[PDB]
Amino acid sequence: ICQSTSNHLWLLSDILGQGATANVFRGRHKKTGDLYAVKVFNNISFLRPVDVQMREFEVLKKLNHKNIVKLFAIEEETTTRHKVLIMEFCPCGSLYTVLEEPSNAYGLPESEFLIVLRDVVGGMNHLRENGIVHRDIKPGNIMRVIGEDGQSVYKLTDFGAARELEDDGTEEYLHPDMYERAVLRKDHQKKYGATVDLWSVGVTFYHAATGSLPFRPFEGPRRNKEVMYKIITGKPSGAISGVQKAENGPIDWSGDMPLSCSLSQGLQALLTPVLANILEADQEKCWGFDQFFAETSDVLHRMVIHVFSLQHMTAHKIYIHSYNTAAVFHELVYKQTKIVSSNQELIYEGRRLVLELGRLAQHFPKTTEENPIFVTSREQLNTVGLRYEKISLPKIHPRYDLDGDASMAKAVTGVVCYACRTASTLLLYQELMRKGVRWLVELVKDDYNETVHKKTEVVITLDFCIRNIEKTVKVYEKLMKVNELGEISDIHTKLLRLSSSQGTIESSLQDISSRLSPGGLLADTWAHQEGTHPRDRNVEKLQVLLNCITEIYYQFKKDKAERRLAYNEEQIHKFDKQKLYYHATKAMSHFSEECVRKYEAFKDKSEEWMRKMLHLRKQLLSLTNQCFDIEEEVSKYQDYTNELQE
Amino acid sequence: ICQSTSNHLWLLSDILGQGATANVFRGRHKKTGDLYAVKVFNNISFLRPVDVQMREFEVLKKLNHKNIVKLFAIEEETTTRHKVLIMEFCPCGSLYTVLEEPSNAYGLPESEFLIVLRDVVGGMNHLRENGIVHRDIKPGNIMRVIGEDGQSVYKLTDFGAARELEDDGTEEYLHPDMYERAVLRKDHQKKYGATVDLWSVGVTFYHAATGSLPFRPFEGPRRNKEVMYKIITGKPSGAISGVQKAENGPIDWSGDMPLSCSLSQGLQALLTPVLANILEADQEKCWGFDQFFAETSDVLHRMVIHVFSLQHMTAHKIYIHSYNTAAVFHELVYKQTKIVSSNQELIYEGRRLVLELGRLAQHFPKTTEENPIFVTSREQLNTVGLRYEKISLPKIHPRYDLDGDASMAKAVTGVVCYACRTASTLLLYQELMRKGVRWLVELVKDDYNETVHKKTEVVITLDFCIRNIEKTVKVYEKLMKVNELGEISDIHTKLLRLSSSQGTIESSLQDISSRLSPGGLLADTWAHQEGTHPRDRNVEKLQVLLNCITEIYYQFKKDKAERRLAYNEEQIHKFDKQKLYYHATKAMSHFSEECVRKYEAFKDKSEEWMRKMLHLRKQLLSLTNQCFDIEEEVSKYQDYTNELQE
Ligand SMILES: O=C(NCCCNc1nc(Nc2cccc(NC(=O)N3CCCC3)c2)ncc1I)c1cccs1
Ligand SMILES: O=C(NCCCNc1nc(Nc2cccc(NC(=O)N3CCCC3)c2)ncc1I)c1cccs1
């Protein structure tokens, strides 16, 4: 069973999109065999001239742009005559298809979210500048295409079909108040048009960022309308999300992102205010489109520099502009870590880092997330570590229900996947911790060696001075025998008084030099015993279990679609259900007993090591300052005044 | 290409109804081959439980009633699974299909309109009493079925599908003001629900009564919305229809029916007020449903008595209740004809008619429209005749356009058909006029004969009286010779004075008896020379021409559906177009020069005859009263006093 045109051909079985106004099928150009999406209008929309066809064709083909699905043609069906739209086929699906993946159950990965933001905002931009104001922007109509470079590109669709065929040929039979409802309708094209798009886009962005809707009531929005109404109409400015727990009561109120959202703190700091200003239900303080575009563009233009706070054990993505100086950079690092500029000490690839007070970000060293700018303070702070949400497995209902079981397996797969991500991140913090510690130790040893250089550099001076006055006085009171003998003796005595202090400094320096050996207390051997290693393979164990669970889930999706099963298929379904329970339970057990425990052990020992290290650092600095004071003092007696002679 | 269930089977080619939510096909029960209409839902409406199915099934099958299309089943499609509705097939089509006939271009025939009213109101009644309030009632969903007795029965459909799938899964993405539009929506279930139905029904009734919408703007309602809005929202109480002529400007205002509407004056008098109260746009004065039902039921329960005003030459349908007396009857006849009760003189089947002051309408004589109660006054009135609308042929545009030509032929066929109806009615008025005149003459002759009977009855009395006093006096003055001789002579003289008057009356009676012969002025020979006769066959000539025109019109409909033609087919189309011009022109020419002219001639001569007849009638009455006075006078001298004797 197939339909066709003069150029294209498609099967009815191969549906892609479904709407009570038109259908989307995947068909081919029969001259080339190329895949295209065809929009066959569900009849009705005819006995209408072909010049509206050509004008709308010209204005829709003018919409030839990235982030917008390309329109190829408007053709007639062979037998049924009704019009079809030849447009670009997006094989990967839409944004909704992506968000339905359990790996994205708690929001998209950060890079992908940046991609989504960029492409959607671009599409809106090109749409508004061409006269078209979108009304409904949702993940359902945000298509996805894999670019030549590998990374995805999102395209807006379903915008030209602004056909008003709803109402309730009832035009010449409706009460004047239905016309008044139509008046209440046409008051949206005033200013309630280019700003509602902002609302829907805000909701879409929250859904993509967190993996869940911003405003949730009982069990679902459509499943409980009357409360949803007040939830939406009630929220004040600054608010982001309002969630209703329990089976009734009020709500919970947040102007921040959910804990389960893994978007970096910086991007989140850039994303919260725009969402708050975009989800407002009045005039002025709802943000006009232009400023929203300037804002989003501002965010999307910034480059990212990865830094790692080694005192809090926390990773950071700083969103700096491509022209901003190092000052604002330090202010951002402070803003996320609460360590102020002059306290910030930086390390890159085993060596120190110093930023000129006006160095641009273009010329900054290139950092991945596994090779960042390690940062530390000079004072004593507390370790913070990863802040995730302790999500627990959903109760796997002992029953038999294909739909419910499919949904259940979806939820479980999502949770276990989140556990996998969290485990990986914990391992990352651990590894970066080890690397940064090794580097920091080997970087303190440098300051030690330099200090010793300075010290001996002054000790040869003391030596030559004392030796010199000894010589000169010896030859003086040998040649002239008598004399002043009691005058220079004080210079000698105070030089010795300096040499003693030098000895003390030598001793203490020896002490710290012993503590930076192996064996001693300030070695990095706790980092080899505590925590989890790559060779432990915990992440890939969780990955195996997650693979089993995922397979079972896909299977339950397939079973759900089949509506009901054969005898054996049913028994297999049950078996695999309990098997899924065991897999998930084992995975979570291994995540808690093996991945988190040792993580926190490593963490605590890292804090207790950080204290000692910082302490010894301060001691070293003190001794260095002492050496400098000695050098300052000895620089006097190099040239002194002798008595005037006749 | 066919779809099927376990019990039914249908073709996609065999469509009946089309809607962007579900489709109606004509299919069969494959066990019996019986025709049924199947409503295959246009997908979308699924992944929804089967208990809503069974409950809605139970509440929709509870709607088993006449004037409502029967619901037979709810079944699954074989392959596509989606639900279909097995319901009664109405082969004749809907009310819209009926109104699209050119014969009903200017409103339905009266009996059929009464049928429509009855059935629609009944359907609404059974619907409201069962919880369902219809929102959209239009000719499009008022199906038609031919009953066993031959006359049509109308059934309401499309009421259970109150599915709210319009809005613009955009629930969790809409701005709060769209929800506020939904609030502006759910304020219709308050009282704006059981009263909007009344509006739509009013519009439907006007459309069925007149053959055109009550509120028309430029070229069309949907073709000009912004004006239609003010046309509807502007009309005051009492108004019925507002039509906008020209290409702009204000409007025309009517609280009455169009001239082209052939609904009888009585039914119209019963129909205008209900429509006015049903097309109001506010609260109290919009009529609650109960009083509307009582009103419509009141109208539908009345019987019809056909009377024919012979002085105005106008037919009338009196809508009397089946229990009302003759008094209210006379008041209705007066109300339509402006002749008051005591002036009304009635004739049935060649004889007089007298109604007791409290005679019920059940026992009234049975009258068709070709055998009515002829009515007349005693005073002198003017003939009115048929009041139709002089509709002219639309300009047949010299061009080539299948759609426009089809529409044109439709209009032309409508006009010519109206001309046919009008011609037939004129012939009817003429024939009833002839019959009633013949009867009235032969009914005056009766009064003449009766008058003569009375007259001679008194003349034998005068004769015997005069003869008697002659005898008695003769024998008196023979036997006694002398005497009083001068006393009785005055009685004799006055008796003779009466006999003279008797002679005069005899003479005048002779005169009127000559005027009721053939030859004389008051014979019915003008009615044989003037006007048009059945043997003239003018109606069937118009019918032949109309047949040609109708054939051409159907052909143009078929050609329109084919979108474009072959060479020869095109040339034939043109030929037949001009042929249609000639047919229509000839028909209208024959209607004017032959049917209307002679009609008005007959009419005028009928007036001029009515004057003379009424005059002679008054003369006859006067002479009768004279005869009665004479009888009263002579009744004295039958017994008189003689002198007292010793
Ligand atoms: O525009 C619409 N729909 C947008 C998508 C349908 N059309 C297109 N589909 C594809 N490829 C594709 C591949 C795999 C899966 C899918 N389907 C989805 O991802 N879905 C289904 C709805 C929710 C998410 C699509 N390419 C281009 C287009 I254009 C409309 C639907 C109904 C009226 S308009
Ligand atoms: O209910 C609907 N439609 C009402 C009618 C369609 N359904 C039925 N049709 C028939 N027989 C029949 C025979 C000849 C012609 C027609 N068609 C018409 O007369 N039309 C087309 C629309 C305007 C007037 C129907 N019997 C029973 C039914 I149920 C709906 C349409 C779309 C969604 S619901």
Task: Tell me which chain B residue has its CA closest to the CA of residue A13.
Answer: B80
**CATH code: domain of residue A586:** 1.20.1270.420
Q: Please check whether residues A152 and A291 belong to one and the same domain.
A: yes
HSE value, Cβ hemisphere, 13 Å, CA-based, for B81: 9
| Interchain CB distance below 8 Å, B196 and A178 | yes
Q: List residues bridging with A345 in a β-sheet.
A: A376
Nearest of B266, B211, B209, B220 to residue B243 by alpha carbon: B220
| Inside any domain, residue A247 | yes
Largest CA distance in chain B: 137
Distance from CA of A270 to the nearest CA of B (A): 22
Distance separating alpha carbons of residues B167 and B173, to the nearest angstrom: 12
Quick check: CB of A162 below 6 Å from ligand 1?
no
Residues 6+ apart with CB under 8 A from B499: B462, B466
Nearest of B495, B429, B486, B446 to residue B467 by alpha carbon: B495
Q: Beta strand A373-376 with A345-348: parallel, antiparallel or unpaired?
A: antiparallel
Distance separating alpha carbons of residues B437 and B431, to the nearest angstrom: 10
Q: Please check whether residues A64 and A138 belong to one and the same domain.
A: no
Q: Could you tell me the residue range of the domain that residue A588 belongs to?
A: 400-646
| Inside any domain, residue A590 | yes
Q: List residues bridging with A11 in a β-sheet.
A: A2
A221 touches chain B (CB under 8 A): yes
Distance separating alpha carbons of residues B423 and B567, to the nearest angstrom: 40
Find chain A residues with C-beta within 8 A of B225's C-beta.
171
| Interchain CB distance below 8 Å, A173 and B21 | no
Radius of gyration of chain B (CA): 36
Distance separating alpha carbons of residues A168 and B197, to the nearest angstrom: 13
- End-to-end Cα spacing for chain B: 129
Task: Tell me which chain B residue has its CA closest to the CA of residue A184.
Answer: B181
| Interchain CB distance below 8 Å, A135 and B168 | yes
Q: Please check whether residues A200 and A289 belong to one and the same domain.
A: yes
Helix and strand element counts for chain A (H, E): 15, 16
Q: How many A/B residue pairs have CB atoms within 8 Å?
A: 124
B49 touches chain A (CB under 8 A): no
Handedness of CA B216, B221, B224, B227 (dihedral sign): positive
A288: left (phi over 0), alpha (psi -120 to 50) or beta: beta
Q: Whose CA is nearest to atom 21 of ligand 2?
A: B17
Boundary of a domain, candidates A56, A89, A122: A89
| Interchain CB distance below 8 Å, B20 and A20 | yes
| Inside any domain, residue B226 | yes
Closest ligand 2 atom to the C-alpha of B87?
29
Residue type, A100: E
| Inside any domain, residue A389 | no
Query: Which of A175, A203, A232 is nearest residue B199 as measured by Cβ atoms?
Result: A175
Radius of gyration of chain A (CA): 36
Asked about A34 being catalytic, the answer comes back as no
Quick check: CB of B273 below 6 Å from ligand 2?
no
Q: Please check whether residues B29 and B57 belong to one and the same domain.
A: yes
Query: Which of B18, B184, B199 is nearest residue A43 as measured by Cβ atoms?
Result: B18
**8 A C-beta contact, residue A115 and residue A153:** yes
Quick check: CB of B520 below 6 Å from ligand 2?
no
| Interchain CB distance below 8 Å, B138 and A232 | no
Q: Please check whether residues B124 and B40 belong to one and the same domain.
A: no
Quick check: CB of B97 below 6 Å from ligand 2?
yes
Q: Please check whether residues A120 and A136 belong to one and the same domain.
A: yes
Q: Please check whether residues B241 and B100 belong to one and the same domain.
A: yes
Q: Please check whether residues B339 and B295 belong to one and the same domain.
A: no
Catalytic residues of B: 136
Residues 6+ apart with CB under 8 A from A298: none
Q: Please check whether residues A100 and A230 belong to one and the same domain.
A: yes
Q: Please check whether residues A11 and A133 belong to one and the same domain.
A: no
Token pair belonging to A178: 């239905």
Cα separations in angstroms, B311 against A612, B21, B606: 128, 59, 9
Query: Which of A172, A174, A213 is nearest residue B213 as measured by Cβ atoms?
Result: A172
Please count the other Cβ atoms lying within 10 Å of the Cβ belonging to residue A458. 21
Task: Tell me which chain A residue has its CA closest to the CA of residue B204.
Answer: A173
Give how far the C-alpha of residue B566 lies from the chain's centroid of Cα atoms, to the nearest Å.
46
Quick check: CB of A93 below 6 Å from ligand 1?
yes
Distance from residue B87's CA to the centre of ligand 2 (Å): 11
| Inside any domain, residue B393 | no
What is the H or E stretch that residue B156 is in?
strand B152-156
Query: DSSP 3-state helix, strand, coil percentages of chain B (rounded to 5)?
Result: 50, 15, 35
Cα separations in angstroms, B519 against B335, B516, B525: 39, 9, 9
- End-to-end Cα spacing for chain A: 129
Boundary of a domain, candidates A322, A346, A380: A380
Q: Please check whether residues A467 and A547 belong to one and the same domain.
A: yes
| Interchain CB distance below 8 Å, A204 and B43 | no
**8 A C-beta contact, residue B267 and residue B273:** no
Please count the other Cβ atoms lying within 10 Å of the Cβ belonging to residue A412. 26
| Inside any domain, residue A440 | yes
| Inside any domain, residue B594 | yes
Find chain B residues with C-beta within 8 A of A21's C-beta.
20
| Interchain CB distance below 8 Å, B281 and A177 | yes
Find chain A residues with C-beta within 8 A of B180's C-beta.
233
Number of domains forming the structure of chain B: 4
Cα separations in angstroms, B477 against A25, B276, B474, B490: 136, 90, 6, 17
Distance separating alpha carbons of residues A65 and A62, to the nearest angstrom: 8
Distance separating alpha carbons of residues B223 and B217, to the nearest angstrom: 9
Distance separating alpha carbons of residues B380 and B608, to the nearest angstrom: 11
Boundary of a domain, candidates A21, A55, A89: A89
**CATH code: domain of residue B16:** 3.30.200.20
Q: Beta strand A303-309 with A373-376: parallel, antiparallel or unpaired?
A: parallel
User: By what technique were these coordinates determined?
Assistant: X-ray
DSSP state of B49: -
User: To what resolution in angstroms was this structure determined?
Assistant: 3.1
B20 is annotated as contributing to ligand binding:
yes
Residue type, B596: V
Distance from CA of A263 to the nearest CA of B (A): 22
Nearest of A257, A260, A213, A208 to residue A232 by alpha carbon: A213
**CATH code: domain of residue A154:** 1.10.510.10
Find chain A residues with C-beta within 8 A of B184's C-beta.
181, 184
Tell me which residue has tokens 């409103």: B107
| Inside any domain, residue B391 | no
Q: Please check whether residues B61 and B148 belong to one and the same domain.
A: no
Distance from CA of A13 to the nearest CA of B (A): 10
Choose from B77, B94, B173 for mutation: most chain A CBs within 10 A. B173
Please count the other Cβ atoms lying within 10 Å of the Cβ belonging to residue A621. 13
Quick check: CB of B41 below 6 Å from ligand 2?
no
What is the H or E stretch that residue A57 is in?
helix A50-61
**Closest ligand (CA of B157):** 2
Distance separating alpha carbons of residues B307 and B375, to the nearest angstrom: 7
| Interchain CB distance below 8 Å, A196 and B179 | no
Q: Which residues of A570-598 are buried (b: 16+ CB within 10 A; e: fewer)?
A: eeebeebbeebbebbeebbebbeebbbeb
**CATH code: domain of residue A345:** 3.10.20.90
